[PDB]
Structure 1
């Protein structure tokens, strides 16, 4: 199999190119073998609404069965519903067949084995099992499990909306359409659906709420319908995007401020995790409410591992993966997070625009991406970590280099999903924003004067 599909957080490829039915089978065999090695014969399997789902999921299941595993086939569900299954069924292992927010032809595997979400060397270990034929053999079984109603009920029973809300819900023709509009209605909302038909061709916009262009239709509908809030889900439902009644995009780091206040209010001293892409304003906010802010690496699998390490009750990423442990299970879930948000907003007499505008804000850049090579991106970062000079500030090298100054911050890191360098800048004035950008531009140039600096 191609090595390129085995990434830091999960397995991801293009069907008909780097991913085939045969690939899914052997990946199934590798996951089954690892699960068995960890004492777990029971594995849940889910798939999103992609065109290739039916073909690949059958092979993934057969690979697991051929290890001797007992598979629980939960059918077509959002990613968090698969994670849910791997928390409430007999087994603590689960595999989700998903291409996340990517174009129609993409697919992949998100993997939990004996409670732990695999990343880094563990994903490489799967690749290595297949190369070595270090694989279990046995006569397993498959049982169909209808888990969506249990998930639905578990959320509905945990949430208490104080007053009715009107909410536009954009599923991007992804799999969140199987539950999100129905569940949000059941919580006590009027729901205006947008692109909620599950359609793996994604004929409307990419199901990627992290890009403002993909929220354009949502913003317009919120305004046209006088809605209280707009919500968007990514293709597999583990990311959420948020729009106020006035059409303001609420980025996930600011969403996390509202959630952090909520969680810490009931859990003094709770650890709250956020990734290196999130606003410095989060650090002060969590600390002020008596929480312990923990900055960590970008990447859903890595955040999940850190949750376990720290006992954190809540985590969030700038990309919109939000992880509730309090009242929940600790995995990322856009649908649950949407429910938690609606609960909080419903208990405030103010509109969603004013609830969010109350929090301090910096001036933030849109994300900067610089295309480099897959085989040079980590070396550029290593070079910066070795050689760079940042002036006076708090320097963090846990993921790339982030520097926090008195009045702003900057970040450069390697993407683990694309051959690019990712940069973020934010400051409380335009002047400071430019000063920080200049520092970073000069440090990049000092490593390699030929690097593009599109900022």
Structure 2
């Protein structure tokens, strides 16, 4: 069985465990959304039935982007919500908390151990999209008009993104904005440059001001400039953190261990409190609540606005917030972003190891490695920060792979940092293949 940190029968008892855990937290009201996945329409029935056979009062918001289901769970009567999505699958909020780790296992263990509530629940249809759409239109303040290419990769974002962007005061060139679970074009994953090539060509050919790309369910956004430069989430956060801290002195801003060190200095320089944390949407949201942070972001493309918003990751709202800021600058999006400091960085580096060894390699490094003049963070793998650059090694959670990133202000410092990591991996196992 798959229960991280799948057919009809699986769906029913997942809905059953969720309902039970929601009720145990004193929350009978649960919202339920699905993405564009082909199995969706049918499979949410089983999820809803699981919930109803608990006594839950379900708000069925139909086919929505993931952050619209999060919105529902913030705005409707109940603080519980379930999103059917395969990035179907499940993103779960119970009594305000986005579940993770030993919480999803606490659900599965209800399945096996038969620890489940029983009752006669309720289903209610709710049309949340117009309220979500209006909520954003009312708060966003666009100045100049902008031409934007929008790539939805045939995911569920095309139900609201091109429309909302047009409504914000934009001319939209849609790309693959028809909801199609078959994903007949590139799969909707703006993290991979390959998935951005159609968008880059389209931005250039149509002389647009910006290109935007959404993932399948809309909780991630990718950004390209009017000249086709891909703007990574860490550089995007630089722009957002500047704006957010400008109205909120001392505000905490969270980012993950893969983000450029430049973001630490930048946030501090504007009077904010930078907070480096672990990877993963659940872990970020949790830290945001713990710290009262106004903004967070992750290298995978999840951006979390609490300021003027609700604090969940929302690719569509983040697009809006981006459009708001760029519309207030006379410069093209290319120059707004290029004005920020830049360093030499590598792409992510993968080393295929084995499932047996991956975590042990990292623990060996945490125990045995020597790092010279370096600040060590072991929040998530081993990250070492030097005055002139930094390096990261972590174990992939889903694949038997070590993941590395390096950044430095110079070509040489890059080498000098890369060299240290190579040596420290070799001290763990001299046979390990270090492809850098």
1:307 and 1:330 in contact (8 A); partners too: yes
User: What's the counterpart of residue 146 of structure 1?
Assistant: 127
2:350 to 369, 374, 385: 369
**Structure 2: which 5+ runs fail to align?**
none
1:396 and 1:403 in contact (8 A); partners too: yes
In structure 2, distance between residues paired with 1:196 and 1:454: 39
In structure 2, distance between residues paired with 1:418 and 1:198: 29
1:410 and 1:425 in contact (8 A); partners too: yes
User: What's the counterpart of residue 166 of structure 1?
Assistant: 147
Kindly provide the CA deviation profile for residues 370-390 of structure 1, in whole angstroms up to 9, marking residues without a partner as x: 233445422222222112111
Aligned-partner SS, 2:130: helix
Kindly provide the CA deviation profile for residues 83-122 of structure 1, in whole angstroms up to 9, marking residues without a partner as x: 00000000001111111xxxxxxx3111111001111111
In structure 2, distance between residues paired with 1:449 and 1:168: 49
Kindly provide the CA deviation profile for residues 413-450 of structure 1, in whole angstroms up to 9, marking residues without a partner as x: 12234332221111111111122112112222222233
In structure 1, distance between residues paired with 2:402 and 2:312: 27
Map 1:40-439 onto structure 2 (within 5 A).
40-99=27-86, 107-439=88-420
In structure 2, distance between residues paired with 1:156 and 1:370: 45
1:7 and 1:417 in contact (8 A); partners too: no
In structure 2, distance between residues paired with 1:58 and 1:421: 39
In structure 2, distance between residues paired with 1:88 and 1:417: 33
In structure 1, distance between residues paired with 2:180 and 2:112: 36
Which is further off, 196-205 or 266-275? 196-205
Aligned-partner SS, 2:433: coil
In structure 2, distance between residues paired with 1:200 and 1:32: 27
1:161 and 1:347 in contact (8 A); partners too: yes
1:271 and 1:294 in contact (8 A); partners too: yes
In structure 2, distance between residues paired with 1:27 and 1:419: 28
In structure 2, distance between residues paired with 1:422 and 1:208: 19
Aligned-partner SS, 1:230: strand
In structure 2, distance between residues paired with 1:63 and 1:293: 42
Please, what TM-score do these two structures have when normalized by structure 1?
Answer: 0.94
How far residue 321 of structure 1 moved from its aligned partner, in angstroms, is: 0.1
- Do the aligned partners of residues 451 and 108 (structure 1) sit closer, same or farther apart at CA in structure 2, a change above 3 Å counting? farther
- Do the aligned partners of residues 147 and 374 (structure 1) sit closer, same or farther apart at CA in structure 2, a change above 3 Å counting? farther
Aligned-partner SS, 2:73: helix
In structure 1, distance between residues paired with 2:400 and 2:12: 27
1:172 and 1:235 in contact (8 A); partners too: yes
1:176 and 1:237 in contact (8 A); partners too: yes
Aligned-partner SS, 2:254: strand
The alignment's C-alpha RMSD in Å is: 1.1
Which is further off, 180-189 or 357-366? 357-366
1:29 and 1:63 in contact (8 A); partners too: yes
Q: Is residue 449 from structure 1 mapped to residue 436 from structure 2 by the alignment?
A: no
Which is further off, 433-442 or 132-141? 433-442
In structure 1, distance between residues paired with 2:377 and 2:82: 33
How far residue 179 of structure 1 moved from its aligned partner, in angstroms, is: 0.4
In structure 1, distance between residues paired with 2:430 and 2:183: 41
How far residue 203 of structure 1 moved from its aligned partner, in angstroms, is: 1.3
Kindly provide the CA deviation profile for residues 383-409 of structure 1, in whole angstroms up to 9, marking residues without a partner as x: 221121112111000111100111111
1:195 and 1:204 in contact (8 A); partners too: yes
In structure 2, distance between residues paired with 1:378 and 1:285: 33
Aligned-partner SS, 1:110: strand
Kindly provide the CA deviation profile for residues 134-186 of structure 1, in whole angstroms up to 9, marking residues without a partner as x: 11111111111110010000000000100100000000111001000000000
In structure 2, distance between residues paired with 1:214 and 1:408: 29
How far residue 364 of structure 1 moved from its aligned partner, in angstroms, is: 1.5
- Do the aligned partners of residues 24 and 372 (structure 1) sit closer, same or farther apart at CA in structure 2, a change above 3 Å counting? farther
Count of aligned pairs: 435
- Do the aligned partners of residues 327 and 417 (structure 1) sit closer, same or farther apart at CA in structure 2, a change above 3 Å counting? farther
1:176 and 1:233 in contact (8 A); partners too: yes
Aligned-partner SS, 1:437: helix
1:372 and 1:421 in contact (8 A); partners too: yes
Please, what TM-score do these two structures have when normalized by structure 2?
Answer: 0.98
Which is further off, 61-70 or 147-156? 61-70
1:7 and 1:416 in contact (8 A); partners too: no
In structure 2, distance between residues paired with 1:89 and 1:371: 45
Kindly provide the CA deviation profile for residues 283-335 of structure 1, in whole angstroms up to 9, marking residues without a partner as x: 00000000000000000110000000000000000111000000000000000
Aligned-partner SS, 1:5: coil
